[PDB]
Structures are given as C-alpha cells and as structure tokens.
Ligand SMILES: *[C@@H]1O[C@H](CO)[C@@H](O)[C@H](O)[C@H]1NC(C)=O
Ligand SMILES: *[C@@H]1O[C@H](CO)[C@@H](O)[C@H](O)[C@H]1NC(C)=O
C-alpha cells in the first residue's frame with residue numbers, strides 16, 4: 226500500500242490550473258483536467274487532475290484527497306468524487322493525480338469533488354469512445370461470451 | 384397496502400446473485416438485475432432485482448427495503464433507490480422483487496441503493512428504447528395531443544393474472560461459518576438452520592448437522608459447508624444454484640403487469656394545403672419524424688407511404 | 699407563407715404593427731387540466747437557417 | 748422461420764402447448780461464476796413490427 | 797488454485813504480484829493481510 | 833414476443849448429472865464439465881475438476897402476450913350488411929340495419 | 931368446491947388447517963403446502979388463505 230506505491234507522492238503537491246469550464250465559466254480550479262487518456266477497450270479512461278487523491282498532508286490514508294484552496298494545501302475526506310461523461314461514471318480507482326473510471330461513451334469529460342458547501346468541478350471537451358473488442362460492435366461489456374485480448378488500464382498502482 | 388399483494392411477499396427473501404458489473408468487475412451484489420423487461424410504450428420499464436422493496440423485517444412498509452448482506456437479512460429505509468439508463472430515470476413504483484421506472488432510451492440499465500457507508504449498485508447491458516405510440520416518432524411523451532391505445536405497465540401492485548415461481552433456496556455456500564477451533568475444524572450453526580458439511584480430509588466426511596459439530600479436519604481450506612434455510616423462498620433465478628433433484632416449485636404474484644391504457648401522442652402541425660388542377664400540393668413542416676400515407680379511392684389504391692423529417696413538399 | 703422565410707414580417711425592429719402567419723391552431727384541453735394547447739408551424743426563420 | 752414472423756406460435760392466448768423456434772443455444776458459464784448464459788435469435792414479432 | 801498464484805481466505809485465486817499493493821482485490825481483503 | 837425462462841441450474845459438486853429432455857417449448861439442456869463456481873460465500877464445492885452444471889433454458893409466452901399479440905386468421909366470404917336511412921313522402925327519416 | 935392436497939391430508943383451498951396465522955405456526959409447512967398444490971386451479975384461494983395473519 227505504501228512501500229513505493231504511494232510514498233513517492235509525498236513530494237508532489239496539488240496545483241491550481243485553468244479549467245475550460247468551472248461549471249458556468251472559465252476559472253482556475255483546484256481540480257483541472259489534463260490528459261484524459263482514453264484508448265482502452267471497455268470504456269475505461271484514466272484522467273489526470275490537479276488534485277492529489279489518496280494523499281493526506283501527513284501521509285497516506287487512501288480515503289483522503291488534497292487540493293489547494295489558495296497558497297495553502299488542504300486535505301479532506303472524499304465526499305463525492307464523481308466523473309461524468311454523459312451519465313455518471315464508475316470510479317474504478319484513484320491515485321495521485323490520476324483517477325481511473327469506467328465511463329459511458331460520452332462527449333465531454335467532467336470531474337468534481339465536494340468540500341463542504343463548495344462544488345469544485347471542472348469539465349473538458351474530450352471525445353470518450355467505447356471501443357469494443359472483437360468482430361461485433363457492442364455498446365456495453367456483455368455478461369457472457371468469449372474472452373478476447375484487449376488493452377485496459379490496470380487498476381494496480383504498481 | 385396489506386391485502387394479498389404485499390402479504391404474499393412475506394414468504395420470499397432477497398438473495399445474492401452475480402451482477403455483471405457493480406461499479407467495476409463482477410460481484411455478488413445484493414441488488415442483482417434480472418429480466419429488465421422493456422416492452423411498454425412510453426418508456427416505462429420494469430426490473431426484477433434480487434432485493435425486495437416494501438417488506439421490512441416483520442410487516443410491510445413501503446418506504447423500507449430488504450436485502451441480504453450475507454446469511455442475514457437486513458431492512459433499511461429506501462434512502463436513494465435510483466434507476467439510471469442514460470439519465471436518471473424516475474421511479475414509478477417498487478414492490479417486492481420488482482421496480483418500475485420511466486427511463487430515457489439508453490444502452491445500459493443500472494439500479495442502486497445506499498445504506499450510507501456503501502453504494503450497492505448493479506448495471507446490465509440491456510437496450511431500452513423509447514417506443515412511441517402512433518405515427519409520429521417523438522422522443523419524450525407530449526404534454527398534449529391525441530390519446531391512443533398504448534400498452535403500459537400498471538402501477539397497481541394488485542395481484543392479478545400473472546405469476547412468477549419461487550422455490551426453496553438451495554443450499555447456499557458459506558465459509559465464515561467455518562472456524563478453526565483447537566487443532567481442528569468447527570462448523571457453527573445459525574440457531575435454526577441446518578448446515579451440510581463436506582470435508583475431504585483424505586477420507587470423505589459428510590453430514591447434515593443441526594448442532595455445533597466438530598470434525599477431524601486440520602485446516603479450514605479442505606472443508607466446505609452450506610447452510611440450509613427452508614423458512615423462506617427465493618425466485619428461481621438462473622444465477623442461484625438449485626438443490627440437485629429437490630425440484631419443488633412455487634408461485635408468486637407479479638405486481639406490475641401489462642395493461643392497455645391511453646398514451647398521448649403528438650399532433651403534427653397542420654400542413655399547408657395548396658390546390659392545382661388534378662394536383663394537391665402539401666407543404667409539410669413536421670417537428671418530429673412523421674408518417675404521410677396516401678391512397679386513391681378508386682380501383683387502383685396506389686398506396687404511397689413515407690416518413691417526413693425535414694420540411695418538404697409533396698404533390 | 700406560414701413557415702418558409704416570411705412568417706414574421708415587422709417593417710422595422712421596433713415596429714408595433716406585425717404580420718404573422720404561423721398557422722396557429724388551438725387544440726382543446728383534455729382530461730380536465732388547465733392549459734392552452736396549440737399546434738403551430740415551426741419558425742420559418744429556423745428552417746431558413 | 749426461426750425469428751421472422753412465426754417464432755412463437757400459440758394456438759390460442761391460453762394454450763398449454765406452444766411452438767417456439769428461437770434457435771436457443773446454451774453456452775458455457777465461464778470464469779467460475781454461476782449463471783445460465785444463452786444466445787438465441789431475437790424475437791420475430793419485434794422484427795415484424 | 798495454481799502454485800504460482802495466491803489463494804485468498806475465501807478460495808479466490810489471484811496473482812502473487814497483486815498482493816499487498818494496497819487495493820482490496822479479494823472481497824474479504826485477504827490479499828492485503830499479514831502485511832508487515 | 834417470447835420470454836426465455838432459465839430454471840436455476842443444478843451443480844452436482846462431484847460426479848456428473850446427465851439431463852433428460854422434457855416436454856417444454858424449444859427446451860435446451862447441456863451439462864458442462866469442470867465448472868468450479870464461486871459464490872458470495874466461497875468456492876461452492878471442493879473438487880476442482882469434477883463439477884458439472886445443468887444449465888437448462890426453455891422459452892415460453894411473454895406476459896405482454898396477454899395485451900399485444902398478432903392474431904392470424906383465415907378469412908372466408910362471410911356476410912354483408914348496411915345501415916340505411918329511408919324517407920318517403922311525409923314520413924321523417926327512419927334508419928335501420930339491413 | 932375446489933380441493934387441495936397437503937401431504938396425505940386432503941382439504942379445501944379456502945380454509946387451511948392453519949387459519950389464524952399460517953406463516954407463524956410452521957413456515958416450512960406453509961410453503962410445502964403451497965408448493966405441492968402448484969397446478970391447483972384455485973391457487974390464489976390457497977395463497978390468500980396461507981398468508982392471512984391476524
Ligand atoms: C412536385 O414535386 C416536386 C418533387 O418534390 C417538387 O420539387 C415540386 O415543387 C412539386 N410541384 C410543385 C408545383 O411544387
Ligand atoms: C340518416 O340516418 C341517420 C341514422 O339514424 C339519421 O341520424 C339521419 O337523420 C338520417 N339522415 C338525415 C339526412 O336525417
């Protein structure tokens with residue numbers, strides 16, 4: 226959990242980058258999407274934020290998330306870390322800057338975490354495509370069928 | 384209510400079946416989607432899940448919901464019971480195993496219920512399509528227009544005319560009821576339910592023991608045990624193991640049943656009709672894809688039917 | 699011509715007089731609820747766009 | 748015809764014997780999960796509609 | 797399970813490399829236990 | 833529209849069960865070998881390779897058949913009748929079926 | 931008058947022998963009764979009388 230998987234992140238800190246849409250307009254958001262990288266098969270996408278997920282200023286607890294409310298860092302319990310493309314996505318995992326989420330094939334990638342009163346959400350225009358594997362196109366991973374090789378972002382942090 | 388419909392679901396119990404994806408990866412989610420039946424017209428669909436809605440631990444109250452987190456039942460308030468196809472659907476009514484909602488078209492169906500530290504969702508790949516009634520393909524039900532016969536599902540729990548079969552739950556696997564006591568295995572009894580034990584320490588040891596029994600097996604791994612509870616029923620899902628030849632069958636009313644009602648359909652704008660000698664020119668400006676069918680009234684029908692999406696003109 | 703380019707023709711942007719041929723039929727309310735249902739040819743301006 | 752109009756032919760609405768030709772074929776449950784996977788021709792009645 | 801693969805307390809077989817990586821693969825969290 | 837009901841399979845943990853065709857519409861059965869299921873509790877039984885599964889499915893009428901269903905008819909000549917209305921002289925209009 | 935079998939006790943299907951609260955004297959017997967009599971034409975008469983408590 227900590228051997229090198231997460232201890233490495235004590236050096237990195239969150240930052241406040243410009244988000245294309247804070248929800249009504251352009252603002253520098255504590256969670257800025259960079260490099261939504263969707264090339265896997267099942268619709269799993271890895272998105273890189275400007276917030277440290279799973280790091281707490283003192284150390285790892287893997288239910289905390291740190292972000293910059295100014296020049297000052299602050300760590301909070303993950304209240305609702307949601308990813309959404311056209312419908313809410315399923316958060317497979319999160320570590321450091323990255324969160325791995327299984328997403329419907331949508332058209333804009335949105336992330337967001339609550340703080341208390343405040344919403345702190347960001348949205349980027351990125352085409353997320355569901356990439357079926359095999360000779361039949363299928364809008365969602367079936368229950369049964371035939372196992373075929375595919376490329377997917379592992380949820381292990383190693 | 385308290386008549387046959389809800390009273391009859393006292394015999395049933397929730398169950399844990401393999402969901403295909405709760406969040407990520409297969410699982411054994413308490414609310415497992417089975418038979419999401421979308422065939423009604425207006426977008427109302429019905430989902431048969433593995434967790435009962437309306438029961439509680441003793442008696443029937445609509446706001447509660449009963450589900451199994453293990454070998455033990457558990458009744459909680461309906462805190463956030465959401466069905467989501469591509470946008471959050473609207474719950475119409477939940478009764479027993481069944482949950483009826485109104486959904487926009489989409490390619491998955493997911494149901495989820497909280498208990499406050501846990502999410503307990505399940506999703507399934509079912510193509511649910513909004514089926515318009517009439518001759519105009521509209522994407523959401525209109526406010527006004529023309530009533531038409533339309534098959535829906537009832538939101539009467541009322542028991543009538545259809546049935547599902549619920550048998551005895553076969554022996555359910557469990558290993559938390561196996562513990563290493565002293566140097567050997569120990570099977571614990573649930574205080575009212577038999578437990579059938581099979582351990583191959585290297586000569587086969589079997590038995591259906593109703594009291595706390597200790598066998599002569601060294602490790603927990605080589606033993607397996609299955610509790611038999613007969614007090615309650617379960618739906619004979621394809622996702623539950625059945626007890627070999629013990630093929631006894633039961634019946635249960637299904638709350639939401641298809642009926643014929645009136646659903647509103649949209650009315651296309653009145654076409655602009657222009658007259659010429661032996662010709663009728665129709666300027667049509669539909670707001671949704673709309674049928675236009677013409678037939679002569681003479682011997683030769685000359686039937687011409689077509690769909691109009693763009694504003695067009697036909698002679 | 700009720701919905702191809704001329705369906706609203708105001709001489710100036712702020713002219714009180716106004717010409718309008720949207721083919722505004724007025725349907726009856728149904729089922730004992732209070733509303734004014736109308737069918738109408740969509741905007742000629744939108745079609746032109 | 749295995750799914751084109753007649754694939755569920757019931758002599759009356761409450762007959763006990765009904766003819767069904769849906770080419771239902773079962774499949775191996777895989778990966779140590781318990782279920783009854785099956786593939787079969789889609790409903791002919793829907794296609795006819 | 798396979799000799800080259802770990803077996804959880806609930807019989808489930810996983811890869812040995814997926815043990816004590818912090819993430820609760822097995823339902824009962826058996827892989828991450830006995831982690832000095 | 834049909835509905836393909838799937839009875840709960842059996843898992844003869846060690847040994848094998850064979851299956852018997854039953855008078856059901858488009859019934860299908862197939863015994864599989866070396867299943868080794870896993871349930872919420874454990875591995876559902878011990879012997880790794882010698883575990884079968886019944887997996888029977890049989891198709892029946894959908895519940896919506898009671899409401900929507902295409903009816904096939906053989907049509908014969910039958911009869912022809914009309915509603916007529918007659919007025920003669922001072923007698924007002926009187927209508928009847930014929 | 932319809933007539934249901936319970937394990938070599940014939941009986942009617944509008945009263946069982948467990949009238950006051952059938953599902954609390956012996957639940958197992960309730961369900962073995964409602965499962966032997968599965969094709970009984972009067973099965974809703976049986977259910978409404980094997981589920982009625984007081
Ligand atoms: C006759 O139909 C053609 C094809 O749609 C159309 O272009 C033409 O305008 C119609 N005739 C008149 C007089 O509008
Ligand atoms: C024709 O018969 C109808 C049906 O009874 C009647 O109402 C009507 O008055 C008749 N025609 C005329 C012109 O009155």
Ligand SMILES: *[C@@H]1O[C@H](CO)[C@@H](O)[C@H](O)[C@H]1NC(C)=O
Pocket residue numbers: 937938
């Ligand atoms: C029912 O009673 C008769 C007479 O006592 C007995 O012969 C029969 O075996 C009983 N039924 C069963 C299933 O034992």
Ligand SMILES: [Ca+2]
Pocket residue numbers: 814815816817818819820821827828
């Ligand atoms: Ca791990």
